[PDB]
Amino acid sequence: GSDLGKKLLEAARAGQKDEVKILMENGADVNAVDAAGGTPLHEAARAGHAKIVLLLLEQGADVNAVDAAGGTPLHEAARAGHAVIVALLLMHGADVNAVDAAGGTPLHEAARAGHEEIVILLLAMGADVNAVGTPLHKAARAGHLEIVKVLLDHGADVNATDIWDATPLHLAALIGHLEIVEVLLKNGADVNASDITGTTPLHLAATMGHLEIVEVLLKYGADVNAYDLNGATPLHLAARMGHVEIVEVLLKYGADVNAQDKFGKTAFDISIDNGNEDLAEILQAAALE
């Protein structure tokens, strides 16, 4: 904007509370923009300087100004974890479900970054719990346990699917987040939901070697002998990865030892192919039964 305007962009960024007041008193344009179409409000929300955020909003700063990437100060404050500023912005009418070029809402960014309080504050002001680019996918992936708890309490879709056919339980299973898998299951997550590849949560748990998770899934009624597009059961995947304990847990719950995949290979075949002594001994015993 004015020459004082970019001096103000200088000062806002720097968190220089004295200098900000000086430049504004000199008639600086509060909605001056930088190269990125960022406003001093964007910069002050990013650095988390309360008093600058006060002085800007009191002088009519645009609460929902967008930079070239579609980002509002509410997006940046939610991303940077400045709870107070998020509050100040929200009180002044910041758009809870404005979306960046990427389809991201503040709730998206807050959930991904693991800012508990901001997620609470957003939800209380009516953030869409099941908007595009699902927060539950990110929270599940990242292992933000409490956030996943808050998400579910606020009515988030437990079995929402991304572009792959993956549900939050798929991601939780894969990453070995046991409690999250617990919370998900008790809220009615589908234990035998399949992505397009024919993978169930149990498949992921067996493959990654997450023993207890495999047990929790099994207790809630996961299919021990479900097959993917390879015609591979959890026992096939467990075998390939040499997971002895998991093979035993699979056996406990009624696994088919002589299930053949689309190569015609059994788990025992796999064990010989890998020269896995331990697996071959236990699988050999199971095959004769």
């Binding site: 998206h108 992936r141 990242a142 990453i175 992921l204 890998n274």
Partner: protein, 210 residues
């Protein structure tokens, strides 16, 4: 090159697994090796951005083992965040699906510039070295010192060095003994995870008479 060394270290740790690692926090290569049957699709999603693809390179190795690997751009190498990876066959069957963190798979180069010096008193030795060249976060790198002696003594001491410290003081040593020293590097917790680097260039010293 220096890449081959680290790839071999990892393969021994997890055969037929999808191994990803970072050398200097500014790139990333994921790779696996398999037998007789790119006929594979490498896709990845990074933190709130849509699902992208990566050019797989195919090259042979070992006993009939084909190694596929993908080098992600420096654009998508920001750390501390879930990075979702999927390897899917031509046929559309799943093959691998991991969630890793960029920061949690650091395999640094070996430390260099070993300098071993005797203390003013018998039995004590001062070792100094340099962080892996052209690496950031020198402050978060921890080292381990190995003290070998010849003649079937083997490894006698294994000493962890604190984060960022490129200095080691050894005691409790036998006098009049030719000891051999090496150091490896690793990223300190909980900000970073990974494996120990390959062991450094050795230097030896003959301790004084006691």
């Amino acid at each position: 090159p220096k890449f081959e060394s680290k790839a071999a270290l990892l393969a021994a740790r997890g055969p037929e697994e999808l191994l990803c690692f970072t050398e200097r926090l500014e790139d990333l290569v994921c790779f696996w090796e398999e037998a007789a049957s790119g006929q594979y699709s490498f896709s990845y999603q990074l933190e709130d951005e849509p699902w992208k693809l990566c050019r797989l390179h195919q090259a042979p190795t070992a006993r009939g083992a084909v190694r596929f690997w993908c080098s992600l751009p420096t654009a998508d190498t920001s750390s501390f965040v879930p990075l979702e990876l999927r390897v899917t066959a031509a046929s559309g069957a799943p093959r691998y699906h991991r969630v890793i963190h960029i920061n949690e798979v650091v395999l640094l180069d070996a430390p260099v510039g070993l300098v071993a010096r005797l203390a003013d008193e018998s039995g004590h030795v001062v070792l100094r070295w340099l962080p892996p060249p052209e690496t950031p976060m020198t402050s978060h790198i921890r080292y381990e010192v190995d003290v070998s002696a010849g003649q079937g003594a083997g490894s006698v001491q294994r000493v962890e060095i604190l984060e960022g410290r490129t200095e080691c003081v050894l005691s409790n040593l036998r006098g009049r003994t030719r000891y051999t020293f090496a150091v490896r590097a690793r990223m300190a917790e909980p900000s970073f995870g990974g494996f120990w680097s390959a062991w450094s260039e050795p230097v030896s010293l003959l301790t004084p008479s006691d």
